[PDB]
């Protein structure tokens, strides 16, 4: 079955793979993150409650006072979104917090407080998010963009090759906390182990192991095994486990049990280890040279002298053995220090250590942190407990603790946010294990190590920084005042909190201005994974590897939609199905392929769970049950594609559209384009402009409805029902009774957004697309937006294209367009410019906006009214007067030189106290009248719905067929009816009606207050006049058009109609492209799009022929059914036998300008299907029609390719780039011309052009190019007199900026001069 707007124009759909998971709501990152941020969240985390429970309770400097936390609450905003964008306020909500003050007594902090006080306090204004997913900061709609950064936890990197120039790789182990001090363990080419804290000075690593109160005996107990030597009657025998001897060449003949095992000069084989462990050999015999370099573990003391025989971690010599042998020790514990197995890295590290106990280690750490000051044991304890071991200054998140347990092979993924002793010891153990040769290092670009922050987490962090500044103020004030006399709003002030959050949302590196000229550009700017910003890398520094697609971007981050230029691969765009995990990583759906059958359950995999399993490719053929029809199937195991068996697979992809993003899944035939041209096509499809009447794509991907409905430019129905009143302003839906609340009678009113300014100076319009009396369903479009049509997404328009060289006018990439295109007004885009004029406050008095103006006459002032402001509707030229303004000297606002327009909307804002002039009172009466009429129509329309409910209830149960309309309509309650649900319902509707009466009274009073009041404004401004010009820019030689595949081009000549190549029917082609761009720039998808567009228009022409002849619905039903079946096993399977002879005529009314065809991305329409659809129309099979010429009237040889391509106009127009300057203004500090176009400036004759004129022999051209034309002021006035008198001659002089160089060098101690 189909929805009623899907019976208007049902898009033909090729495609073979039956879908199982539809496209999710495309704005779920922004909305879900900010819903996670601001919501009443119990059990502590996440949200604002995490900040308010981690920074509170503020306890004082031992004054026994404490400011603890209760709850919070956000009130309603004073301004809704529309008034906020008009006036210019933030769209914020006040953050009320309930704080409590308690004050303890003397001698008992575990005793009773004498007095508490709990109260409401005001702090900050956090800006809310609109339903589109955007913020309104100062009247300009802004987006905060998700950041891709390093995951907190341990990270074992390897500084490969480059250091020490000898190939010896290093290994470092960066512990990355979420908030606190970093910690980098590393090696050096002497194979010592070095710690460092926050990239500061370097210490040997075991100095922190003493700082955790470990003795050296315990350290060697941890980081090494033991070797036991027993002195038993002969040559100091040894306990030997032969696994340590795997490949070691002994120094003697190892024999045991009267049997020679190992010979001198040979090594111990593995089978000799098997012999020694099979015979269970324990004690072997060593020479005196064997313990010549063995390292003792613990301290041995002589019992008689009380001295030290040998210190810990010391090699043993002959005299040390002679001392400890005669003291009474039979057991000797040493360490195993092999070449391959276990290096003595800990032992060499302890030999570099000068420290000896806990205190000296804490002193040295306190000295490397803060240099050159007296340490004290209390200060060293406090610093080292506040580096890693305090809840305040150090905090891994849950993400950090998960990565730190997972990368150390733990079990519990839950732990504390602070470190401990076992954590650092496990980091050093894993680092030594990586140095030993077992285990692997971790790459950086792997998406199991890249977390995604969003709006909620970054706003929480900035709010937390505001709170630690305010706890730095409350700790100041709390124990330095008289108690009890103050309340907790005199202490805490809202300036740092609001300053922090307002600086983050106002100007950050990630809170950026929304590129809004297209529904696609909105919905793909909100889905952006930027690597830049705070905590990430920078553009002009890094690098190589991060600008490259890793093998685990498959289905998380789009590989082909990224901006080319200085930041490729850093401004990644997130894919279609890609959600965000609980912790912040990326996850993507798959289908659990149990042992034979592809089960239709979806199952979200992260980036590290994907690697262990094995995933089938998306388009693998399966026969109606899930059984894979091949016995070799293409899969990918561990980041590496291969060919696997039938039933060793564990997952299949969901749909074939999931590698790409929503920018580059509206490209039909994407699998035929080379990836560079698909990148340029997706980026230019983002850069489109909305035309006047947007049409539709004939060749789409079916993804248009998700991008249109799941954005916020169309007016989606909330509750379905029957339309009651359509208008260009409003739309009224009457809600069906099986969707309807019992109370609040309810018929909905959609106030559309008519002609208003977007951010890119386009024209964001909404047009109603429903008829009257028409049913609508829940979840359905009512009003099309900009670049939409019937709920689809129509960016550009589809035109008749031919690929042929035509007389050179399409030489490199140019485009040649018939005048039939510009006559139909079909690229005529509508732009809106906002021109502001402020009435400031200066000396000699304030300014005047009135029209009594000097130096002007009738010809200027005829287009102004009697109070200076231009009319609404006056079509002005470039350089007239819009607002007349004179200062205590003409300073009237003028149209900037070049642009026409029609003044559509004038706003006047008045700072309160200033006299409103007559036009400001006219606008006040106008908006009073509009808001009065609008709220009165709210009351009338909802009262009409309420009375219709009363009529619907009184059909039964005491019905009065004639007596109902004899009495006035406001008394439909006291009629004959007992105590039932109906009199209860009439009482509830009377409650609703009296609520509407008193609500209408109070809301009209509040709306008169909002219109009548002034507005807070800039320091020293009287009134602001804003005027909206509405230019209509058509098309001309110089604009940029482009298709959807990377075929760019400046349109080069707008030919007449007659010159166009026509065919043997009569129709001229509209646009003549260039064929030579196809084999080099390998975008072969545009030719398949051209042929399938010609097939679509062939079906449309046959419908137009079968309908223009007034044929009955039977033949239309026949032909539309044949055009909708037409293919292989497909998904569509429609039938017109359930459309009932009236929808088929209206469906053919919508198909007569062409039949829309969906072609999904990697499961598209093959060549034979295009041929069979070109055979259904009577077009030629090869797609090529023979074409005549317009000039000569004789045939082009070798018939050419025509069809329809869907081409977009880009907003790089030519009357926004063109500029010229004879003599304008000059800069102030260096007397050179200004830069730019708005400032009337000159083009930079840069350095390489100076080199290119030195490279010729042009000497006078360069002399006037940098002395006369540019800098020397007396030289250029002499030049201007000489040019207007006909004498071409220059008096050179000196550049004045060289005198500026002399003054800047001379302002140092340097004495530069000019000799002779």
């Amino acid at each position: 079955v189909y929805s009623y707007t899907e019976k208007k124009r049902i898009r033909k759909d090729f495609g073979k793979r039956p879908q199982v998971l539809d496209v999710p709501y495309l704005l779920s990152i922004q909305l879900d993150s900010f819903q996670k941020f601001i919501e009443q969240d119990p059990e502590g985390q996440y949200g604002l409650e995490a900040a308010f429970r981690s920074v509170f309770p503020i306890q004082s400097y031992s004054g026994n006072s404490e400011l603890q936390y209760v709850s919070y609450r956000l009130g309603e905003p004073v301004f809704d979104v529309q008034e906020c964008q008009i006036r210019g306020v933030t769209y914020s909500a006040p953050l009320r917090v309930k704080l409590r003050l308690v004050i303890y007594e003397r001698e008992a902090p575990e005793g009773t407080v004498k007095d508490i006080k709990e109260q409401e306090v005001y702090m900050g204004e956090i800006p809310l998010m609109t339903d589109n997913g955007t913020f309104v900061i100062n009247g300009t709609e802004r987006v905060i963009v998700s950041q891709l950064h390093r995951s907190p936890g341990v990270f074992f990197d390897s500084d490969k090759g480059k250091t020490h120039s000898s190939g010896k790789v290093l290994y470092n182990a960066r512990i990355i906390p979420y908030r606190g001090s970093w910690l980098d363990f590393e090696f050096d080419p002497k194979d010592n182990l070095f710690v460092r804290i926050d990239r500061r000075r370097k210490l040997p690593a075991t100095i922190i192991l003493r700082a955790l109160n470990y003795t050296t005996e315990q350290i060697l107990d941890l980081f090494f095994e033991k070797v036991i030597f027993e002195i038993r009657d002969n040559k100091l025998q040894m306990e030997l486990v032969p696994e340590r001897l795997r490949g070691e060449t002994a120094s003697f003949d190892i024999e045991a049990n009267g049997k020679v095992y190992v010979e001198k000069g040979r090594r111990i084989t593995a089978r000799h280890i098997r012999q020694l462990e099979k015979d269970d050999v324990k004690l072997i015999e060593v020479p005196v040279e064997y313990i010549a370099g063995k390292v003792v573990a613990k301290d041995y003391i002589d019992e008689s002298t009380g001295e030290l025989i040998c210190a810990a971690n010391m090699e043993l010599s002959l005299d040390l053995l002679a001392k400890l042998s005669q003291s009474g020790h039979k057991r000797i514990e040493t360490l195993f220090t092999n070449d391959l197995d276990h290096g003595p890295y800990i032992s060499e590290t302890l030999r570099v250590d000068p420290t000896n106990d806990r205190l000296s280690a804490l002193v040295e750490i306190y000295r490397m942190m803060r240099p050159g000051e007296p340490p004290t044991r209390e200060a060293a304890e406090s610093l080292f407990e506040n580096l890693f071991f305090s809840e305040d200054r150090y905090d891994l998140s849950a993400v950090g603790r998960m990565k730190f347990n997972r990368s150390l092979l733990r079990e519990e993924i839950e732990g504390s946010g602070i470190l401990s002793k076992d954590d650092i010891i496990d980091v050093m153990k894993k680092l030594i294990d990586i140095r030993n040769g077992k285990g692997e290092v971790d790459d950086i670009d792997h998406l199991g190590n890249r977390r995604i922050r969003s709006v909620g987490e970054m706003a929480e962090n900035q709010f937390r920084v505001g709170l630690v500044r305010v706890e730095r103020a409350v700790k100041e004030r709390l124990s330095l005042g008289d108690l009890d006399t103050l309340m907790p709003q005199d202490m805490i002030n809202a300036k740092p909190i609001s300053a922090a959050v307002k600086e983050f949302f106002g100007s950050s590196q990630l809170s950026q201005f929304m590129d809004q000229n297209n529904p696609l550009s909105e919905i793909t700017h909100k889905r952006r994974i930027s690597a830049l910003g705070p905590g990430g890398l920078t553009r002009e520094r890094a690098g190589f590897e991060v600008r490259d697609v890793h093998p685990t971007h498959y289905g998380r981050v789009c590989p082909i939609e990224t901006p080319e230029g200085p930041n490729i691969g850093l401004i990644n765009s997130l894919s279609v199905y890609a959600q965000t995990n609980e912790y912040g990583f990326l996850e993507t759906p798959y289908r659990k392929v149990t042992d034979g059958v592809v089960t239709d359950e979806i199952h979200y995999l992260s980036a590290i769970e994907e690697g262990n399993y094995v995933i089938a490719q998306a388009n693998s053929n399966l026969d109606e049950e899930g059984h894979f029809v091949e016995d070799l199937v293409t899969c990918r195991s561990k980041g590496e594609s291969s060919l696997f068996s039938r039933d060793q697979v564990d997952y299949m992809d969901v749909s074939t559209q999931q590698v790409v993003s929503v920018g580059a899944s509206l490209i039909p035939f994407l699998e035929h384009d080379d990836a560079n041209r698909a990148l340029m096509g997706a980026n230019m499809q983002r850069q489109a402009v909305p035309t006047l009447r947007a049409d539709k794509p004939l060749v789409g991907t079916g993804m248009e409805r998700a991008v249109a409905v799941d954005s916020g430019v169309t007016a989606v129905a909330k509750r379905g029902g029957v339309v009651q009143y359509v208008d260009a302003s409003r739309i009224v839906i009457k809600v069906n009774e099986d969707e309807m609340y019992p109370g609040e009678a309810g018929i909905d009113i959609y106030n559309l957004t008519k002609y208003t300014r977007s951010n890119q100076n386009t024209c964001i319009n909404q047009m109603p697309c429903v008829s009257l009396g028409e049913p609508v369903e829940r979840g359905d479009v009512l009003a099309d937006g900009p670049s939409t049509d019937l709920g689809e997404l129509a960016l550009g328009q589809n035109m008749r294209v031919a690929f042929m060289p035509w007389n050179g006018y399409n030489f490199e990439d140019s485009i040649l367009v018939s005048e039939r295109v510009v006559q139909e007004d079909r690229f005529t885009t509508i732009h809106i410019q906002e021109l502001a004029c402020v009435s400031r406050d200066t000396k000699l008095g304030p300014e005047e906006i009135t029209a009594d103006i000097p130096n002007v006459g009738e010809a200027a002032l005829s287009k102004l009214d009697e109070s200076g402001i231009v009319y609404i509707g006056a079509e002005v030229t470039g350089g007239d007067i819009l607002v007349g303004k004179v200062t205590p000297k003409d300073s009237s606002l003028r149209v900037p030189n070049g642009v026409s327009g029609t003044v559509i909307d004038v706003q006047v804002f008045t700072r309160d106290g200033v006299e409103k002039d007559k036009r400001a009172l006219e606008i006040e009466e106008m908006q009073l009248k509009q808001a009065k009429k609008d709220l009165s129509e709210e009351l009338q329309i909802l009262e009409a719905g309420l009375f219709s409910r009363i009529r619907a209830v009184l059909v039964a149960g005491g019905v009065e067929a004639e007596k109902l309309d004899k009495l006035p309509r406001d008394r439909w309650l006291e009629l004959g009816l007992t105590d039932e649900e109906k009199q209860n319902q009439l009482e509830q509707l009377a409650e609703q009606y009296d609520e509407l009466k008193h609500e209408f009274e109070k809301k009209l009073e509040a709306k008169r207050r909002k219109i009548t009041q002034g507005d807070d404004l800039a320091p020293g401004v009287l009134k602001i006049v804003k005027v909206y010009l509405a230019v209509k820019r058509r098309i001309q030689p110089g604009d940029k058009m482009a298709g959807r595949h990377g075929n760019k081009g400046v349109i080069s000549k707008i030919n007449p109609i007659e010159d166009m190549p026509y065919d043997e029917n009569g129709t001229p082609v509209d646009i003549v492209l260039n064929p030579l761009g196809v084999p080099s720039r390998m975008n072969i998808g545009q030719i398949l799009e051209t042929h399938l567009g010609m097939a679509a228009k062939g079906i449309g022409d046959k419908i137009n022929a079968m309908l223009k002849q007034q044929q009955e619905v039977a033949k239309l039903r026949e032909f539309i059914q044949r055009a909708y079946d037409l293919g292989a096993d497909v998904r569509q399977k429609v039938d017109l036998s359930t459309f009932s002879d009236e929808e088929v005529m209206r469906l053919a009314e919508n198909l007569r300008k062409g039949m829309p065809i969906a072609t999904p991305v990697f499961d598209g329409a093959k060549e034979a299907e295009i041929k069979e659809l070109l055979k259904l129309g009577d077009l030629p099979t090869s797609g090529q029609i023979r074409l005549y010429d317009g000039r000569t009237g004789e045939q082009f040889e070798r018939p050419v390719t025509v069809g329809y391509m869907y081409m977009l106009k880009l907003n790089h127009l030519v009357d926004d780039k063109m500029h010229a300057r004879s003599t304008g203004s000059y800069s102030l500090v260096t007397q050179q011309p200004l830069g730019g176009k708005a400032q009337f400036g000159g083009q930079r004759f840069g350095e390489m052009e100076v080199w290119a004129l030195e490279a010729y022999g042009a000497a006078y051209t360069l002399q006037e190019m940098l002395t006369v034309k540019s800098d020397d002021v007396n030289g250029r006035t002499k030049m201007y007199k000489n040019i207007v008198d006909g004498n071409h001659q220059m008096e050179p002089g000196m550049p004045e900026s060289f005198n500026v160089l002399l003054k800047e060098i001379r302002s140092l101690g340097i004495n530069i001069e000019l000799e002779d």
Binding site: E1254, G1257, A1258, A1259, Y1260, Q1263, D1272, F1298
Partner: protein, 66 residues
């Protein structure tokens, strides 16, 4: 090498218009070094004719009248 061959000139304005300006101007400051505009780029700085094309004939005239 070309960056050291260009920083080691008998003309401090060329070596100042190239890389580090601090070291070049301090060395030429304490040495009392005296540029004589010596070619192309100093004359592009100071605003006169290049001694390459037509300005080469002008510079032969100017040097002959010295």
């Amino acid at each position: 090498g070309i960056t050291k061959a260009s920083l080691a000139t008998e003309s401090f304005i060329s070596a100042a218009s190239f890389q580090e300006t601090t070291r070049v101007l301090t060395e030429a400051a304490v040495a009392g070094k005296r540029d004589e505009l010596r070619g192309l780029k100093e004359n592009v700085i100071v605003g006169r004719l290049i001694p390459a094309g037509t300005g080469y004939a002008y510079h032969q005239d100017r040097m002959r009248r010295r």
